[PDB]
Protein backbone atom coordinates (compact mmCIF):
# COMPACT_ATOMS: atom_id res chain seq x y z
CA UNK A 1 0.00 0.00 0.00
CA UNK A 2 2.73 2.46 0.93
CA UNK A 3 4.50 1.36 -2.26
CA UNK A 4 1.51 2.30 -4.46
CA UNK A 5 1.24 5.69 -2.72
CA UNK A 6 4.94 6.24 -3.47
CA UNK A 7 4.27 5.27 -7.07
CA UNK A 8 1.48 7.88 -7.17
CA UNK A 9 3.85 10.57 -5.90
CA UNK A 10 6.31 9.50 -8.60
CA UNK A 11 3.74 9.66 -11.41
CA UNK A 12 2.31 13.06 -10.46
CA UNK A 13 5.69 14.73 -10.16
CA UNK A 14 4.41 17.78 -8.41
CA UNK A 15 6.43 17.57 -5.25
CA UNK A 16 10.04 18.52 -4.75
CA UNK A 17 11.06 15.08 -3.49
CA UNK A 18 13.95 12.64 -3.94
CA UNK A 19 13.18 8.92 -4.03
CA UNK A 20 15.91 6.38 -3.29
CA UNK A 21 14.99 2.98 -4.76
CA UNK A 22 17.23 0.41 -3.10
CA UNK A 23 17.98 -3.06 -4.39
CA UNK A 24 17.23 -5.10 -7.47
CA UNK A 25 13.85 -6.30 -6.14
CA UNK A 26 12.70 -2.70 -5.56
CA UNK A 27 14.02 -1.64 -8.97
CA UNK A 28 11.98 -4.34 -10.73
CA UNK A 29 8.78 -3.29 -8.93
CA UNK A 30 9.20 0.33 -10.00
CA UNK A 31 9.79 -0.61 -13.63
CA UNK A 32 7.11 -3.30 -13.81
CA UNK A 33 4.32 -1.12 -12.40
CA UNK A 34 5.31 2.27 -13.82
CA UNK A 35 9.89 17.24 -13.23
CA UNK A 36 10.02 17.93 -9.49
CA UNK A 37 10.47 14.31 -8.33
CA UNK A 38 13.92 12.72 -8.57
CA UNK A 39 14.29 8.93 -8.67
CA UNK A 40 17.64 7.25 -7.98
CA UNK A 41 18.39 3.55 -8.05
CA UNK A 42 21.09 2.30 -5.68
CA UNK A 43 22.09 -1.33 -5.10
CA UNK A 44 24.60 -0.50 -2.34
CA UNK A 45 24.09 1.21 1.03
CA UNK A 46 27.47 2.90 0.66
CA UNK A 47 25.88 4.88 -2.18
CA UNK A 48 22.91 5.95 -0.05
CA UNK A 49 25.15 6.94 2.87
CA UNK A 50 27.37 9.02 0.60
CA UNK A 51 24.42 10.74 -1.05
CA UNK A 52 22.76 11.64 2.25
CA UNK A 53 26.13 12.97 3.44
CA UNK A 54 26.39 15.10 0.29
CA UNK A 55 22.84 16.36 0.74
CA UNK A 56 23.79 17.44 4.27
CA UNK A 57 26.86 19.48 3.28
CA UNK A 58 25.24 21.10 0.20
CA UNK A 59 24.45 24.70 1.02
CA UNK A 60 20.90 24.89 -0.28
CA UNK A 61 17.92 22.67 0.49
CA UNK A 62 16.87 21.07 -2.81
CA UNK A 63 13.97 18.77 -1.82
CA UNK A 64 11.11 19.16 0.64
CA UNK A 65 10.96 15.37 1.05
CA UNK A 66 13.35 12.41 0.95
CA UNK A 67 11.93 8.90 0.53
CA UNK A 68 14.02 5.77 1.15
CA UNK A 69 12.41 2.69 -0.40
CA UNK A 70 13.86 -0.80 0.10
CA UNK A 71 16.14 -0.56 3.15
CA UNK A 72 15.16 -4.06 4.25
CA UNK A 73 16.35 -5.47 0.92
CA UNK A 74 19.88 -4.04 1.02
CA UNK A 75 20.32 -4.82 4.71
CA UNK A 76 19.51 -8.45 3.93
CA UNK A 77 16.85 -8.32 6.63
CA UNK A 78 15.51 -11.79 7.24
CA UNK A 79 14.64 -12.86 10.78
CA UNK A 80 15.89 -10.66 13.61
CA UNK A 81 18.62 -8.12 13.05
CA UNK A 82 22.23 -8.95 13.97
CA UNK A 83 24.66 -6.37 15.34
CA UNK A 84 26.12 -5.56 11.91
CA UNK A 85 22.66 -4.79 10.52
CA UNK A 86 21.76 -2.60 13.49
CA UNK A 87 24.98 -0.68 12.88
CA UNK A 88 24.28 -0.11 9.18
CA UNK A 89 20.58 0.68 9.73
CA UNK A 90 21.41 3.22 12.44
CA UNK A 91 24.07 4.86 10.28
CA UNK A 92 21.48 5.33 7.52
CA UNK A 93 18.81 6.62 9.91
CA UNK A 94 21.19 9.06 11.62
CA UNK A 95 22.48 10.36 8.29
CA UNK A 96 19.03 10.66 6.73
CA UNK A 97 17.55 12.62 9.63
CA UNK A 98 20.71 14.72 9.72
CA UNK A 99 19.51 16.08 6.36
CA UNK A 100 16.19 17.04 7.98
CA UNK A 101 18.06 18.86 10.77
CA UNK A 102 20.27 20.62 8.21
CA UNK A 103 17.64 21.58 5.65
CA UNK A 104 14.26 20.87 7.21
CA UNK A 105 13.09 18.23 4.74
CA UNK A 106 10.70 15.41 5.58
CA UNK A 107 12.31 11.96 5.69
CA UNK A 108 10.14 8.94 4.90
CA UNK A 109 10.99 5.24 4.82
CA UNK A 110 8.83 3.04 2.59
CA UNK A 111 9.21 -0.74 2.67
CA UNK A 112 9.05 -3.07 -0.33
CA UNK A 113 6.95 -5.95 0.97
CA UNK A 114 6.59 -6.48 4.69
CA UNK A 115 8.40 -3.93 6.89
CA UNK A 116 10.82 -5.24 9.52
CA UNK A 117 9.54 -4.52 13.02
CA UNK A 118 13.01 -3.85 14.45
CA UNK A 119 13.91 -1.45 11.64
CA UNK A 120 10.68 0.39 12.44
CA UNK A 121 11.81 0.61 16.06
CA UNK A 122 15.20 2.07 15.10
CA UNK A 123 13.60 4.61 12.76
CA UNK A 124 11.29 5.79 15.55
CA UNK A 125 14.26 6.39 17.86
CA UNK A 126 16.13 8.65 15.41
CA UNK A 127 13.02 10.60 14.48
CA UNK A 128 12.83 11.83 18.09
CA UNK A 129 15.87 14.03 17.39
CA UNK A 130 14.18 15.82 14.47
Amino acid sequence: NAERALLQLVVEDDAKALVFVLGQDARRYFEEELQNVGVMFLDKLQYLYMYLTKLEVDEAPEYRTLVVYGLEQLLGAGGELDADQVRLASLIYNTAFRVRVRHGAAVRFVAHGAPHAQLQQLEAHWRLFT
Binding site: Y49, M50, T53, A83, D84, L91, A124, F129
Partner: protein, 195 residues
Amino acid sequence: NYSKLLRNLVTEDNVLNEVVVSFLYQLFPRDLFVRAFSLLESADMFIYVWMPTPKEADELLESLYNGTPLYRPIVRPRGPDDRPVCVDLDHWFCSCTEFAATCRPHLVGDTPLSDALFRPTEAADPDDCFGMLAGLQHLRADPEKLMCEHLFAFAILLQTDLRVLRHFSTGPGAQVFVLGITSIDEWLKLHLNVV
Protein backbone atom coordinates in the same frame (compact mmCIF):
# COMPACT_ATOMS: atom_id res chain seq x y z
CA ASN B 1 26.84 16.19 36.88
CA TYR B 2 28.98 14.30 34.32
CA SER B 3 30.23 17.60 32.87
CA LYS B 4 31.25 19.08 36.24
CA LEU B 5 33.21 15.93 37.08
CA LEU B 6 35.08 15.71 33.77
CA ARG B 7 35.64 19.48 33.56
CA ASN B 8 38.28 19.07 36.26
CA LEU B 9 40.50 16.98 33.98
CA VAL B 10 42.44 20.15 33.09
CA THR B 11 43.54 22.79 35.59
CA GLU B 12 43.12 26.52 35.02
CA ASP B 13 46.74 26.68 33.84
CA ASN B 14 46.09 24.09 31.10
CA VAL B 15 47.72 21.28 33.07
CA LEU B 16 46.38 17.71 33.22
CA ASN B 17 45.04 17.05 36.72
CA GLU B 18 46.74 13.82 37.75
CA VAL B 19 44.63 13.48 40.89
CA VAL B 20 41.41 13.69 38.88
CA VAL B 21 42.72 11.20 36.31
CA SER B 22 43.53 8.72 39.08
CA PHE B 23 40.00 9.10 40.45
CA LEU B 24 38.34 8.74 37.04
CA TYR B 25 39.71 5.21 36.69
CA GLN B 26 37.76 4.28 39.84
CA LEU B 27 34.67 6.29 38.90
CA PHE B 28 33.67 4.72 35.58
CA PRO B 29 32.67 1.13 34.67
CA ARG B 30 34.00 -1.17 32.01
CA ASP B 31 37.43 0.46 32.16
CA LEU B 32 35.73 3.28 30.25
CA PHE B 33 38.17 6.00 31.29
CA VAL B 34 41.39 4.11 30.55
CA ARG B 35 39.88 3.18 27.19
CA ALA B 36 38.76 6.75 26.54
CA PHE B 37 42.07 8.16 27.79
CA SER B 38 43.98 5.78 25.50
CA LEU B 39 41.95 7.12 22.56
CA LEU B 40 42.70 10.71 23.58
CA GLU B 41 46.46 10.09 23.37
CA SER B 42 46.34 7.76 20.40
CA ALA B 43 46.59 10.58 17.86
CA ASP B 44 43.72 8.85 15.97
CA MET B 45 40.97 11.22 17.07
CA PHE B 46 39.93 13.88 14.54
CA ILE B 47 37.27 16.59 14.58
CA TYR B 48 36.73 17.67 10.97
CA VAL B 49 34.80 20.97 10.81
CA TRP B 50 33.13 22.00 7.55
CA MET B 51 34.76 25.37 6.87
CA PRO B 52 33.72 26.63 3.41
CA THR B 53 34.88 30.14 4.46
CA PRO B 54 38.29 30.18 6.19
CA LYS B 55 38.02 30.82 9.96
CA GLU B 56 40.55 31.54 12.70
CA ALA B 57 41.79 28.38 14.41
CA ASP B 58 40.53 29.63 17.78
CA GLU B 59 37.15 30.40 16.19
CA LEU B 60 37.00 26.74 15.13
CA LEU B 61 37.62 25.27 18.61
CA GLU B 62 35.37 27.92 20.17
CA SER B 63 32.65 27.25 17.60
CA LEU B 64 32.52 23.67 18.86
CA TYR B 65 31.16 24.92 22.19
CA ASN B 66 29.29 28.13 21.31
CA GLY B 67 28.66 28.08 17.54
CA THR B 68 26.71 25.72 15.32
CA PRO B 69 29.37 24.21 13.02
CA LEU B 70 28.83 21.15 10.88
CA TYR B 71 31.58 18.92 12.29
CA ARG B 72 32.52 15.25 12.07
CA PRO B 73 34.23 13.55 15.04
CA ILE B 74 36.07 10.56 13.55
CA VAL B 75 38.51 8.00 14.92
CA ARG B 76 41.08 7.08 12.28
CA PRO B 77 41.76 3.42 11.54
CA ARG B 78 44.80 2.11 13.46
CA GLY B 79 45.55 -0.72 11.03
CA PRO B 80 45.08 -1.94 7.44
CA ASP B 81 41.99 -3.91 8.54
CA ASP B 82 40.03 -0.97 9.81
CA ARG B 83 37.33 1.53 8.86
CA PRO B 84 36.84 4.92 10.50
CA VAL B 85 34.53 5.33 13.48
CA CYS B 86 32.28 8.40 13.40
CA VAL B 87 30.37 9.85 16.37
CA ASP B 88 27.26 12.05 16.51
CA LEU B 89 27.21 13.31 20.10
CA ASP B 90 23.99 15.31 19.73
CA HIS B 91 22.23 12.03 18.86
CA TRP B 92 24.39 9.91 21.20
CA PHE B 93 25.37 7.77 18.22
CA CYS B 94 28.52 5.90 17.29
CA SER B 95 29.19 3.79 14.22
CA CYS B 96 31.28 1.29 16.19
CA THR B 97 30.22 -2.31 16.73
CA GLU B 98 29.87 -1.87 20.51
CA PHE B 99 27.18 0.76 20.01
CA ALA B 100 25.12 -1.48 17.74
CA ALA B 101 25.69 -4.58 19.90
CA THR B 102 24.38 -2.75 22.98
CA CYS B 103 21.19 -1.51 21.31
CA ARG B 104 20.27 -4.75 19.52
CA PRO B 105 18.97 -6.74 22.54
CA HIS B 106 16.63 -3.84 23.40
CA LEU B 107 14.88 -3.92 19.99
CA VAL B 108 11.51 -5.42 20.88
CA GLY B 109 8.05 -4.74 19.66
CA ASP B 110 6.32 -1.86 21.15
CA THR B 111 9.03 -0.41 23.34
CA PRO B 112 10.86 2.91 22.95
CA LEU B 113 14.57 2.31 22.51
CA SER B 114 15.19 5.45 24.57
CA ASP B 115 13.28 3.90 27.48
CA ALA B 116 15.96 1.21 27.68
CA LEU B 117 19.04 3.41 27.13
CA PHE B 118 18.21 7.03 28.12
CA ARG B 119 17.36 8.74 31.41
CA PRO B 120 15.05 11.61 32.41
CA THR B 121 16.41 15.14 32.42
CA GLU B 122 14.72 16.45 35.52
CA ALA B 123 17.33 15.39 38.04
CA ALA B 124 20.22 16.80 35.97
CA ASP B 125 21.82 20.14 36.61
CA PRO B 126 21.34 23.06 34.23
CA ASP B 127 25.02 23.45 33.30
CA ASP B 128 25.74 19.74 32.65
CA CYS B 129 25.92 19.33 28.89
CA PHE B 130 27.15 15.72 29.05
CA GLY B 131 24.89 13.46 27.01
CA MET B 132 22.50 16.29 26.17
CA LEU B 133 20.34 15.36 23.18
CA ALA B 134 19.34 17.79 20.46
CA GLY B 135 15.57 18.07 20.24
CA LEU B 136 14.62 16.01 23.27
CA GLN B 137 14.31 18.27 26.30
CA HIS B 138 12.98 15.56 28.54
CA LEU B 139 15.57 12.83 27.88
CA ARG B 140 19.32 12.53 28.05
CA ALA B 141 21.74 9.74 27.25
CA ASP B 142 22.47 7.38 30.14
CA PRO B 143 26.20 6.58 30.09
CA GLU B 144 25.68 3.60 32.44
CA LYS B 145 23.36 1.90 29.94
CA LEU B 146 25.04 2.96 26.68
CA MET B 147 28.44 4.53 26.17
CA CYS B 148 31.44 3.29 24.18
CA GLU B 149 34.91 4.78 24.49
CA HIS B 150 34.41 6.85 21.31
CA LEU B 151 31.39 8.66 22.71
CA PHE B 152 33.16 9.08 26.07
CA ALA B 153 36.35 10.44 24.52
CA PHE B 154 34.54 12.99 22.36
CA ALA B 155 32.03 13.96 25.06
CA ILE B 156 35.01 14.67 27.34
CA LEU B 157 36.35 17.00 24.65
CA LEU B 158 33.09 18.65 23.61
CA GLN B 159 30.70 18.52 26.61
CA THR B 160 32.92 19.72 29.48
CA ASP B 161 34.68 23.03 28.83
CA LEU B 162 36.51 24.76 25.99
CA ARG B 163 39.59 24.51 28.20
CA VAL B 164 39.47 20.71 27.97
CA LEU B 165 39.25 20.72 24.17
CA ARG B 166 42.05 23.26 23.83
CA HIS B 167 44.25 21.14 26.11
CA PHE B 168 44.19 17.97 24.02
CA SER B 169 44.09 19.73 20.63
CA THR B 170 46.60 22.61 20.91
CA GLY B 171 50.18 23.06 22.06
CA PRO B 172 53.05 20.58 22.08
CA GLY B 173 51.03 17.79 23.71
CA ALA B 174 48.45 17.86 20.93
CA GLN B 175 47.07 14.37 20.31
CA VAL B 176 43.63 15.43 19.03
CA PHE B 177 43.37 17.19 15.67
CA VAL B 178 40.71 19.76 14.80
CA LEU B 179 40.89 20.50 11.07
CA GLY B 180 38.80 22.81 8.92
CA ILE B 181 37.63 21.33 5.61
CA THR B 182 37.21 23.82 2.75
CA SER B 183 36.35 21.50 -0.18
CA ILE B 184 33.36 19.25 -0.75
CA ASP B 185 35.56 16.55 -2.29
CA GLU B 186 37.72 16.42 0.85
CA TRP B 187 34.54 16.33 2.96
CA LEU B 188 33.00 13.48 0.97
CA LYS B 189 36.32 11.61 1.02
CA LEU B 190 36.16 11.51 4.82
CA HIS B 191 33.10 9.24 4.68
CA LEU B 192 34.03 6.88 1.86
CA ASN B 193 35.04 3.95 4.09
CA VAL B 194 32.63 4.45 7.02
CA VAL B 195 30.01 1.99 5.62
